[PDB]
Amino acid sequence: MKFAEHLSAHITPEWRKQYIQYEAFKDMLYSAQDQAPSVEVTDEDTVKRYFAKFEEKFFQTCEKELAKINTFYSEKLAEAQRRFATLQNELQSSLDAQKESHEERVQHRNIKDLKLAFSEFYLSLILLQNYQNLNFTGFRKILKKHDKILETSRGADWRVAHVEVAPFYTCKKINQLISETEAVVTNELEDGDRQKAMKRLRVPPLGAAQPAPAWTTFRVGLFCGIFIVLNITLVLAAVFKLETDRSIWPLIRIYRGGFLLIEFLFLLGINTYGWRQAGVNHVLIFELNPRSNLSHQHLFEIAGFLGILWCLSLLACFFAPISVIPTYVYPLALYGFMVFFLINPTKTFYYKSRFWLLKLLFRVFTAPFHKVGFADFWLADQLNSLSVILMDLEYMICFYSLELKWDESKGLLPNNSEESGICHKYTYGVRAIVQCIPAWLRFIQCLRRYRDTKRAFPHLVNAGKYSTTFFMVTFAALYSTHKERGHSDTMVFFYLWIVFYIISSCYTLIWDLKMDWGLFDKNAGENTFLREEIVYPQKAYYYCAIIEDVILRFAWTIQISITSTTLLPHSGDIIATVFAPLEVFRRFVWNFFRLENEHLNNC
Amino acid sequence: MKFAEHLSAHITPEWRKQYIQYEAFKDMLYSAQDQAPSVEVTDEDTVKRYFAKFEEKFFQTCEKELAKINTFYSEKLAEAQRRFATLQNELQSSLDAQKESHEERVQHRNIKDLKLAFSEFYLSLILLQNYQNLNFTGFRKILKKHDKILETSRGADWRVAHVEVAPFYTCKKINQLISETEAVVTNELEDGDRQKAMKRLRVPPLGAAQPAPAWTTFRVGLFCGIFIVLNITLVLAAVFKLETDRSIWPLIRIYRGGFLLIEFLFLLGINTYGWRQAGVNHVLIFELNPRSNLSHQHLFEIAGFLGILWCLSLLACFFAPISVIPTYVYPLALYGFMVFFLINPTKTFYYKSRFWLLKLLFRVFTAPFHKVGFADFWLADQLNSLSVILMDLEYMICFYSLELKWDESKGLLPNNSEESGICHKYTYGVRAIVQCIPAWLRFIQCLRRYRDTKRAFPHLVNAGKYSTTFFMVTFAALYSTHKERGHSDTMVFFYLWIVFYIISSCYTLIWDLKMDWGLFDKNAGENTFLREEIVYPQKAYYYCAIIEDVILRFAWTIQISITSTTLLPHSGDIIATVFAPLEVFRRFVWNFFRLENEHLNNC
């Protein structure tokens, strides 16, 4: 309400402290009004002296904040012109190089980068202009409010004697700067095409939140409703219309991956909504284009659509109304549709989003030959917690290639055959390597980062933490195969195994609480066990995260060990399936604090 | 982009012609720019005289439109001043009467009515201010556009010489007016409470469409999705899970009403959406409070929720999980929930809407005594199209009270008993009166209107129209009972019956095309077979309405005749079911044109 929430919505995520503290002056004026001693206990001289002293303190605070505004604006303007001169020099160099093939491609990439730089400079200039306008509006509003409450005209005199003569308000150099940038872009860059110049230099109202179209919200609601009703009917159909002829392992073992993917997309949508609400400049961190970024609603829509596809495919797998090929087409059809959706080459269905995502995925998969950005290793750590999809895909390809009789029906082939359990076994080695692929990719990425930076800490320690999983999985496999062979010394390999269990968790957990989040700092001060500046209002969120992460790390390591070792022949698959949709929740809660730590400590 | 859509959304409907014809100015300037031939083709003298003559014509047109705007503003200000004087006199009289029981209640209703009058006055003055500001903005906008396209500075000089001195902008009496009204409201009425004074006089941004919350759209989507999935599963369950041993009539004949009502609500939501989009001032016509009106989204939400309840009740009726009572609680429970939803006495679940609708329904059901508004007889005619709900309700009461053995099970009592078919008969004759109730109410309303106005040409004939249903139903009942008795002269009563068929349709259809819509106008002729002015862009809508209404009138009259005559033992309920959900569509298509015609002629 009023200018208060307007300013609060128009806060720049970077310079939040530099803005006028409308709330502070608001509450201190109400504090002035609230005291109000008894009407007849003392002379009106005391009341007027109280009014005068509080007015003097109000003027002192206003002058202090005004001086801070002047200094901040002058400094900002200083680097504004210095950056303008630097970009003008670069533009002149590029133009004179062009005026006088590989050279043409270099000029093309340079001018495109220059256009992007001019775009961000124009955003900076308009941000400064909005800064000045918001400060002026806040000053006029607070002075009017004060003149109203104190029923005096002193606020107007203070404003006219201070504000309209303030250097920040009197300086119009920002307008000449933006006009010169616009003219340069129109003339030198666009060759007189003013329309294209503006179209590239548009600035959508980022300050006014985001005008989400009603159609997107309606579609999200429709998809959510259809998904929940399909889920309910799936539960009822599974409970009632299922008979007993086979233990239904393959169906869950195949659809667990789709369930994990859908849950991950939903949680990432919640994650980005919280990121936007908290004020963390995530778009800058991911070097995304500020013109076009995906809000949470699109992620919710995509998650709902994939959930619909998965649920209908699984329900068709149960019921199987009528066909010629009985049941082993639905999972294949669903996965084919998903993979084709991901690689759609037309300019439809978020073409830029899919292109950028697949480019990032190719970069992260070929990481040993690429640099390290924040969008790269974050996706690598995202994939590190989703080894279950790779496991399920390998199991599905094994089942459909070797075990399943392709030209047959039903799909409950006898388990008494020797070929039953070919990849329910582990001596093939096709389980340890698949599980360790994410760890290997992440570790080699960290090693390349260290080599590029030439700085041992913290990259070597990080590489060790990523490499502990190698020992974990390999020794679990050794124990499993030696138990299969029934050797006398096999039990010995159990002992140190448990040791390497602990040296994993208590290790990585520490890495999760010192460098990833920067908590437990020596300068906690008033906030025991926490950090000085926390964006989220409540510390109970931090407490629940710190109490859940310790359990979830043990859960993840034990679940990956049992998945790759396949002991406990009955309950092993059940424990793996039940523990799978918990590490994803851990990965969801981890991102909040990871980025709120990175945003403050840029580093 | 430009201010085109800005004004097109911000133009007040009832003064749309008075605003700037900015679009015409755009297109004429674009035509002027495009018509210029090549430089080499024509001499520069011809080019310059072209610019000179078109500039002169542009200035002439702008002078004409500004003169019209000044005259309009002067007249508006004069009537605003006279209205202000009148309301000041009324306030003075009220306050001096108050200063010097029934008298207190009269004073209370006077002060509330005066508060409403001041609200309307403040809204009108703010509308005038918005008009003036938009006109000034449009002038400066088109002038700078002309200056940029003609690369001349003549526009600025013309603006400062004409627009700056223009009487509409120079007259600042509007601000003194609003300040005086605000001061009077704060002091005389609110007794110094400025906060309550402005909150009662707050004006939401009606010009900027409507900021619909995203939560409402999400809820609408969720309800629509759940409804469509429940509909599909109900269709499949009815096709497969239902057998045929005792027919399904005693179920559809009770569950038709919920579908009818839900369809009516959905179509009414469509009506209000189209009404808002086309610009027809429907809120003024219904004397609704302009600050609190229901957009289409709320109607869609209510329709979806009722659809969910009805579909769930029907689905539970099919499968019928059994604890004690087999099947005859679901319809009663659903109807009880609906009626309790309508009569909720708390302040939740649309507190104002339900109270207003209940008051209107009571007023229309006490038609012979209370007066006539617009919403009154509009709702009367709206209910005249839904006699099927009353038919189904009385049939439900008849079945549950007499035929149904409530202390039994199943719900498929044999039809071989003598009492069976009594409720399928008409010996009591209740069908005729139940069907003829809406006609009687509408006739009484028209008779009261005629008596009050003492003018027979537009009222007495209106009453005479609604008496044909009486003769139709009575003659149908006579034919049915004489056929049941098998008298020799029975067939004779058929003959005139068919006659009174035609004298119904060809009569009321004419009434639907002359006074209800104002079509076929002799004074017209700009558009063949249409009126002088239309609001919807396409005449094909009028053509399809005029081609469908002729069929629908015959359909409605034959369906009511067959419903109340109890003939065609096999196809009777079938024809009733297939014809019922289309008369509501006829009412839906009728409302649009009825209100666009009532908006202009003002009968």
Ligand SMILES: O=P(O)(O)O[C@H]1[C@H](OP(=O)(O)O)[C@@H](OP(=O)(O)O)[C@H](OP(=O)(O)O)[C@@H](OP(=O)(O)O)[C@H]1OP(=O)(O)O
């Ligand atoms: O792209 P828009 O948002 O519609 O901007 C239009 C206009 O473009 P159009 O004439 O095609 O409508 C001008 O662009 P050009 O004609 O010069 O190519 C532009 O110019 P300036 O910013 O330099 O004034 C000006 O933008 P703005 O909204 O900031 O005033 C504004 O002009 P019009 O509303 O008069 O058309």
Ligand SMILES: O=P(O)(O)O[C@H]1[C@H](OP(=O)(O)O)[C@@H](OP(=O)(O)O)[C@H](OP(=O)(O)O)[C@@H](OP(=O)(O)O)[C@H]1OP(=O)(O)O
């Ligand atoms: O919050 P609003 O009801 O929209 O109005 C507030 C304010 O009330 P608050 O004291 O609760 O903040 C003033 O109320 P009064 O003390 O004068 O009764 C009012 O004053 P004016 O309308 O006379 O200016 C002014 O409204 P406006 O937005 O038109 O300036 C605006 O105050 P602020 O926006 O400056 O905080």
